[PDB]
Structure formats: C-alpha cells, structure tokens
Symmetry: D2
Amino acid sequence: MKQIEDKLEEILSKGHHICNELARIKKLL
Amino acid sequence: RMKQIEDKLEEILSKGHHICNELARIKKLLGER
Amino acid sequence: RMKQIEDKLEEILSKGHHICNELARIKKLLGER
Amino acid sequence: MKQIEDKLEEILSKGHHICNELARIKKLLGE
C-alpha cells in the first residue's frame, strides 16, 4: 500500500504541475 | 479559433484539477483500511 | 470499497486518455496557423 | 509557438505515462 500511495502522490503532484503549465500556455495564446 | 482553443484549455485544466482531487481522495481512502 | 476504487480509477484512466487526445488535437491545430 | 507545441507534447507524453501507472495500480488493488 505505501508504494501505491506514494505513486498516487507523485501523480498528484505532477498533475498540479501540468495544470500550471496549461494555465501558462493559455495566457501566452 | 484562438479563443476556442483558450476556452478548451480552461476546460481541460478544470477537469485536470478535478481528477487530481479525485486521486487525492483515493489516496486517503487507501491509507485508512 | 476496493471494487469502487478500481472502477473510479478506470473512469479516471479513460478521462485522462480523452484529455491527452484533446491536447494532441490542440497541438496539431496550433502548428497549422 | 514551437515552445508551446513542444510543451504540449511533453505534457501528453507524461499523461500517457500517468495512464499506464494508474492502470498498474488498478491491477494491484484487484488482489
């Protein structure tokens, strides 16, 4: 379970990064 | 055409935030039992 | 409870694949004009 | 423009990675 939970938190944190990137791209366009 | 793409990006990053919230919920549940 | 979480992960999977397809579409459009 | 495209390709790349990871996790929980 700890590996699953740590992987979901990794994916979480990358999804947040992806949302920030798409926000940045939207503003440039 | 550009306004359509900007609005689609806003939609996707909204859905992306929702997905992340759903995964955080799942992570919480999986740690309890 | 576990079956519910597995089914939700399959929903999220599907939605993430759809999102990627949408972004690939956007990437195509933005390179044309 | 090339910067934007290359970032979108990085992102959807990583999205495919995320989907494979979630598919792996679903299988593990199926136990």
